[PDB]
Amino acid sequence: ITGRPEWIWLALGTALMGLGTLYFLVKGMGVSDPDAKKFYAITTLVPAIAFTMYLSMLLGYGLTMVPFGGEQNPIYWARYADWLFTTPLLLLDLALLVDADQGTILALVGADGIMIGTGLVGALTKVYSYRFVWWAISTAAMLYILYVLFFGFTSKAESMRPEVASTFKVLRNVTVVLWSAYPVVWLIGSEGAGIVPLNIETLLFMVLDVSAKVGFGLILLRSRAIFGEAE
Amino acid sequence: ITGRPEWIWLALGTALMGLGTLYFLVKGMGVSDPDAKKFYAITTLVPAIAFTMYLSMLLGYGLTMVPFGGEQNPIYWARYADWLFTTPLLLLDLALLVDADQGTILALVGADGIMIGTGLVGALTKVYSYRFVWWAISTAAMLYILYVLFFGFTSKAESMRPEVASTFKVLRNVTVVLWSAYPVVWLIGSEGAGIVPLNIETLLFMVLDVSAKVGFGLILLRSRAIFGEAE
Amino acid sequence: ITGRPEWIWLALGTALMGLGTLYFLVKGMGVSDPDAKKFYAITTLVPAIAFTMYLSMLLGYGLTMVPFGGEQNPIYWARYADWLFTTPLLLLDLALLVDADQGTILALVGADGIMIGTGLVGALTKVYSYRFVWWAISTAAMLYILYVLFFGFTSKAESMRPEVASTFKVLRNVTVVLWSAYPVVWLIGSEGAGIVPLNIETLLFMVLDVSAKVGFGLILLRSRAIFGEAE
């Protein structure tokens, strides 16, 4: 395990996701409100899935070698397995907060699936120049998602409770900033142009992942917006 | 890319799915009705997914070699990845049109999953005679789906709005004819008996795919059946 | 096929799932009640999926070799493909019976996904001692599911119809006993410590699978709890 310099960040990531999972699990024990239960379920599952995939990367299972540029390049494929399930759960948290219509939710989840799926294909593609074609398609799917979060959701939040409108606005802003960093790190890291070494890349993704999951969850689950308006 | 004679049909397929995706995306921009949004979301996602998988076939990612009959046989596995997601979306379009009950929808999607999954296993099976066992099981799942579309849905459409009944009937008929061709092409093509060469097989699937997705979508999204009855 | 001593149990399993599938399919033909249709759909799909995966194991497709302990160890990976889809369907049968809230259903299905997914990783892991780390995480996800079935569902059933409360209690008890055997068989069988040989392991899983699917389904589909209260 320690044979890879990036192991320290995989281990820290595993620990922080594990701790985040346990914290949300305990916190949600005292919850009976049916609406709050939905948000706790979604939000606890996110770091639990990430915990398993960080562990698989730490132990070496979630790593494969991909030939491109005349080299055997270490590619952590387990990231995409994580993201396939956790990024639509994160979007679902946002969509339920603002009572999004079903068509909009399906558009978001579908675009998200395309985003992660094409990122996976790009990560595993052996023809170097083609990796960036997949990156571009994935990034276009991301831009669609960000567009919807701003010009379909923000003006939906404003007709809702003030506490859900303010909580949505904060989580929207956190999401757009954090999620936009992922394609940049991929592009300059070992999957793309290879300018930033894998150990630093792994650190960067770990900070983004913990912030986008445990950070996000801490903000959401401390808000009164997750509860039905009750006396 | 041009090293494979079937590349021209993969390229045309990619282009037509891409163009179809953009057309539906633009067309649905001016839509606020919650019901119509569902149909636009579902129907736009279908060629978008197909676009990505056609591209993966064009670039060579979605192709593998399978030993059977003492030969290395080129198998485009990306078709099944496409179909796994797009065929239940197509069925969902039909089921929502007639306000199908939840049990019926689950039966359809489940049978569809079995249909595509067993087709994939058959496509990748190395014992030649066993490929046709999987083809038979998949075809039985197809026949179940077609049965339900006729003797569970058609008489559901007739108690609904005339515009939804007439639109459903047309899309049902398009679906049954087009979908029934797929097992025949598989059986006589490079996956099955090998009587029709891969380049012609690829052409045939491209015509079926564009018709079943973009053709289907053009009929559906031009109907007033996708809108709630409103003043 | 007969080259593997466990083939007889794979063949019997295939037959019993096939027969169970046909029986439930015929039985549900005379059903119009929308609630009952849901239970028939879910419950018929379960042995149908299991039939396909038992067949893939019989024909040899669903088997791979995994190096650990200095040996090539036969691992039937198709079990996890089965279980990935059938165990959440089984939980859905239980959850719908007691009209579980959406948050609880998502927690169950999510924990179940983690349970099966980590079992799959453990089954395919090449470092022997690490296989048991994945077994432990999977078992913890199982224990969560069993906890919810007892201390979240049982007291939900009691405020419902007596026929649904009594049917739920029986199916809950069947589920907890049968499902708890699976991690034990894995641990002592060819995936784990290797004390029980593969042919006996295969027998054990076949008895558990038929009981947990066809047995379970026979109890559920003969109950009046699956019908809406109607005059």
Ligand SMILES: CC(C)CCC[C@@H](C)CCC[C@@H](C)CCC[C@@H](C)CCOC[C@@H](CO)OCC[C@H](C)CCC[C@H](C)CCC[C@H](C)CCCC(C)C
């Ligand atoms: C509604 C939304 C969910 C829409 C989803 C959007 C989605 C369509 C976007 C594209 C997804 C698609 C790229 C998934 C591809 C998975 C694939 C990378 C798995 C690895 O297999 C690739 C090659 C080795 O590189 O296998 C070597 C050759 C092997 C023989 C491969 C044969 C097995 C195939 C992988 C079977 C395909 C199954 C499905 C792709 C399962 C989807 C997995 C998940 C990653 C989407």
Ligand SMILES: CC(C)CCC[C@@H](C)CCC[C@@H](C)CCC[C@@H](C)CCOC[C@@H](CO)OCC[C@H](C)CCC[C@H](C)CCC[C@H](C)CCCC(C)C
């Ligand atoms: C409700 C509905 C959805 C019901 C669904 C119906 C469904 C049950 C029908 C059968 C689906 C099942 C056949 C999927 C099999 C996928 C498999 C072909 C992927 C390729 O792996 C096959 C061999 C190489 O040929 O791998 C070589 C050996 C490797 C070590 C394989 C180990 C990895 C396994 C593939 C893990 C299994 C994961 C699940 C099958 C994911 C499902 C993928 C999708 C195609 C259904």
Ligand SMILES: CC(C)CCC[C@@H](C)CCC[C@@H](C)CCC[C@@H](C)CCOC[C@@H](CO)OCC[C@H](C)CCC[C@H](C)CCC[C@H](C)CCCC(C)C
């Ligand atoms: C809401 C709930 C559903 C939550 C779900 C919980 C879930 C997160 C729990 C963990 C699931 C995760 C372990 C699935 C891993 C599948 C993996 C074993 C498939 C086989 O690939 C493993 C190695 C060979 O051993 O591939 C060799 C290297 C290859 C290059 C691998 C590259 C292809 C990757 C497999 C692509 C990943 C796609 C997704 C994992 C699809 C999920 C399949 C299913 C088994 C969950």
Ligand SMILES: *C/C=C(C)/C=C/C=C(C)/C=C/C1=C(C)CCCC1(C)C
């Ligand atoms: C918890 C993990 C999260 C929130 C991950 C988010 C990841 C993305 C938004 C990834 C986006 C990518 C692209 C837009 C193109 C390049 C490849 C990706 C997959 C890194």
Ligand SMILES: *C/C=C(C)/C=C/C=C(C)/C=C/C1=C(C)CCCC1(C)C
């Ligand atoms: C957009 C793509 C569509 C509508 C594809 C439909 C495909 C089928 C109905 C495929 C059916 C098959 C069988 C019935 C058995 C042989 C294998 C298949 C998968 C080709």
Ligand SMILES: *C/C=C(C)/C=C/C=C(C)/C=C/C1=C(C)CCCC1(C)C
């Ligand atoms: C129809 C099949 C059923 C009901 C299978 C149930 C399987 C399980 C509950 C498996 C549990 C496992 C663990 C808890 C850890 C070890 C690995 C598994 C996957 C066997």
Ligand SMILES: CCCCCCCCCCCCCCC
């Ligand atoms: C969105 C953030 C992307 C920028 C990442 C900056 C990383 C700077 C680290 C120094 C680069 C290491 C190069 C020498 C090894």
Ligand SMILES: CCCCCCCCCCCCCCC
């Ligand atoms: C459902 C349509 C299946 C029939 C396809 C007919 C294809 C005819 C093309 C000629 C066959 C090529 C054989 C000589 C290369």
Ligand SMILES: CCCCCCCCCCCCCCC
């Ligand atoms: C939950 C049941 C697990 C116990 C399984 C008992 C199997 C006993 C069979 C005898 C073991 C075979 C060892 C000699 C080959």
Ligand SMILES: CCCCCCCCCCCCCC
């Ligand atoms: C490819 C995996 C996509 C599914 C991820 C799980 C999250 C799905 C959330 C469903 C949202 C509800 C839509 C109506």
Ligand SMILES: CCCCCCCCCCCCCC
């Ligand atoms: C194996 C992939 C199956 C899922 C495909 C996505 C479409 C699912 C549509 C869900 C229909 C709603 C059922 C209640």
Ligand SMILES: CCCCCCCCCCCCCC
């Ligand atoms: C990884 C596969 C998980 C999906 C299995 C299919 C069963 C899903 C049942 C959905 C229950 C409804 C939740 C709201």
Ligand SMILES: CCCCCCCCCCCCC
């Ligand atoms: C186009 C929608 C406006 C809100 C999205 C902001 C786009 C940020 C760009 C992210 C950088 C990705 C490379």
Ligand SMILES: CCCCCCCCCCCCC
């Ligand atoms: C049995 C249901 C009647 C409607 C379905 C028509 C079946 C068409 C056969 C398709 C050919 C597949 C090989």
Ligand SMILES: CCCCCCCCCCCCC
């Ligand atoms: C902790 C919840 C109480 C009900 C679950 C009973 C646990 C049975 C243990 C199963 C054995 C697995 C190794």
Ligand SMILES: CCCCCCCCCCC
């Ligand atoms: C070796 C790099 C070749 C450049 C490929 C860039 C493709 C980016 C596509 C953006 C439309």
